[PDB]
Write an enzyme that holds these catalytic residues in place. Sequence first.
Site, PDB file in Angstrom:
ATOM      1  N   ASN A 181       0.508  -1.007   5.271  1.00 25.46           N
ATOM      2  CA  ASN A 181       1.473  -0.345   6.144  1.00 25.46           C
ATOM      3  C   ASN A 181       0.907  -0.408   7.557  1.00 25.46           C
ATOM      4  O   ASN A 181      -0.103   0.240   7.850  1.00 25.46           O
ATOM      5  CB  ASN A 181       1.707   1.107   5.726  1.00 25.46           C
ATOM      6  CG  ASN A 181       2.366   1.232   4.370  1.00 25.46           C
ATOM      7  OD1 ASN A 181       3.578   1.424   4.273  1.00 25.46           O
ATOM      8  ND2 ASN A 181       1.568   1.136   3.313  1.00 25.46           N
ATOM      9  N   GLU A 210       0.834  -1.193   0.000  1.00 31.24           N
ATOM     10  CA  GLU A 210       0.000   0.000   0.000  1.00 31.24           C
ATOM     11  C   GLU A 210       0.873   1.248   0.000  1.00 31.24           C
ATOM     12  O   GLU A 210       1.896   1.304   0.689  1.00 31.24           O
ATOM     13  CB  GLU A 210      -0.913   0.006   1.227  1.00 31.24           C
ATOM     14  CG  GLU A 210      -1.542   1.356   1.537  1.00 31.24           C
ATOM     15  CD  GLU A 210      -1.945   1.495   2.994  1.00 31.24           C
ATOM     16  OE1 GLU A 210      -1.193   1.018   3.870  1.00 31.24           O
ATOM     17  OE2 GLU A 210      -3.015   2.081   3.262  1.00 31.24           O
ATOM     18  N   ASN A 269      -6.951   6.494  -1.206  1.00 31.88           N
ATOM     19  CA  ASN A 269      -5.932   5.469  -1.012  1.00 31.88           C
ATOM     20  C   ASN A 269      -6.286   4.323  -1.954  1.00 31.88           C
ATOM     21  O   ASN A 269      -7.322   3.673  -1.787  1.00 31.88           O
ATOM     22  CB  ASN A 269      -5.897   5.020   0.447  1.00 31.88           C
ATOM     23  CG  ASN A 269      -4.690   4.159   0.773  1.00 31.88           C
ATOM     24  OD1 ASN A 269      -4.195   3.410  -0.069  1.00 31.88           O
ATOM     25  ND2 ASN A 269      -4.216   4.256   2.010  1.00 31.88           N
TER      26      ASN A 269
END
Lengths: 302, 304
Positions: free
Chosen positions: B193, B46, B106
Amino acid sequence: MTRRIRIGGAQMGAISRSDSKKEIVDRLIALLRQASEKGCELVVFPELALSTFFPRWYAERDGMDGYFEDGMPNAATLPLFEEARRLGIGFSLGYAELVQEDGRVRRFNTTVLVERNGEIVGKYRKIHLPGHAEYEPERSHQHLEKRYFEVGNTGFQVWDAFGGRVGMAICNDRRWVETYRVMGLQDVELILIGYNTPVADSETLGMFHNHLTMQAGAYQNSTWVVGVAKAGVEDGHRLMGGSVIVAPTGEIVAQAMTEGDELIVADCDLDRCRYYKSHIFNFAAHRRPEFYQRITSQTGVE
Amino acid sequence: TRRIRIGGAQMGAISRSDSKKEIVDRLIALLRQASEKGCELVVFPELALSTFFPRWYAERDGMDGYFEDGMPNAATLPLFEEARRLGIGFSLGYAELVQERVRRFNTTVLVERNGEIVGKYRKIHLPGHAEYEPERSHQHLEKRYFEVGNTGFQVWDAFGGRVGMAICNDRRWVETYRVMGLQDVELILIGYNTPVADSLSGESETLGMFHNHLTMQAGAYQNSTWVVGVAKAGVEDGHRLMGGSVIVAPTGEIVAQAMTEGDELIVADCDLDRCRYYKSHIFNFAAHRRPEFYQRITSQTGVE
């Protein structure tokens, strides 16, 4: 610990077809009394703890009523209720329920939750019925739960009991994530699950999957999970053991070592459920139900 | 027949002082390791194109320097070209800037072996908080810099099977796996993460690796799907990120696992047909699921 309750997992050994009901109830009372001596306030019994696992045998749809309970409690199970009421211990008990509702006779795979004062808290009726309804000789063993039971009409309920939020599920309910989440959305802190899991006459994978679903359901809903087995070999049919008490971290804090009648004990702080509920698993702050519609819309795959 | 050799391209730490070229060069180096190992699909972490900036407090638009304007753009085109030359597909996490006003997501993009984008997923479950909180040892402001994604948990026909994507904190929610499992998913790609230290106390979470694998192994088993979890790990400007990248079989078993907290490639041959076996034997959704008792999952957001 600030909201501690000492829980006893009362794993049972094999119940045979030739075992009388008094022999079965006496084995429950003995496990009940051992939990009293060790200070337990709640003892969890397995699924269908009052008979052999009769779904393995083929008969008429009404031919198993001899294994059902006409009332809860009745003359056979009253000694258990009265001994628990005398010692001040609550319990959850699985049994085959025979009930008269809206005109007809109805049959459920049921677990009852009883408070330390002897009053019945609530009643969960099994939702996910595994196996099949007709005789299938291609199977190494029959699993005719869908033939002798109806789908329960209670839902995954959560009650105010034992100083917190207590829920119940039965057996193969524990491998569906919807089971834990539905009760997690009711702020559950303790899920009681008895089970009878058939197993071939390697075997670590079955035990791995057994604990994996309960440890994940406990952590991902920040709730305690108690999985109590009815293990051993019942008339040539082996049942899985491995009863556990799981913390809201997903950690196993108590585990059975035998496949017979065995009590596991753990001090369970219900306030330990609070941390994840306010941060990593704060449902109100993180969940987005507008993306979960497939879970409640469809049954199969699309 | 439907075997796909997957490389898990775990990344080491990315500092605030690292340039985008240095980051792309590290992605290309991992991409070439996977080529020499015969990988056909490489999974990246990510937000693999920048430091994990949600730990820093700025304005709501002050992190746009870490975002991607276009995918690919001039800076990321060398990665797409190397992948296309090698005939390898990949999934890549990044911070997405898109005009619809300005919207910030994201996001992970899935690219097929011919270099063609198959789809994008935008993070649904945003962890942390939106305002600065001084009582925390470190901040985690994903709710501040990103908005909830508008793609849903999609599942695509790619790489010879059914491929879905999720991002980081998504892997802790059962709805993530089940929504895609109800779309017959066979391979879920998850970059993440995860700080080792607790945000509020700053103490090292000893069950961090346990919870990391527990949620992914359970999601794999309970939906009869492969799961690939790929971390960006290491110490980013004094902030330690968790490692433990893993490839999980539809049995919930770990078949490959990272051993370091730096750039590291894990490889495993994943037969997507194993999902068919465990979907027909156990976990038959059409035969056991009773959606009339699950209504709370979509009728309420938090606890009642």
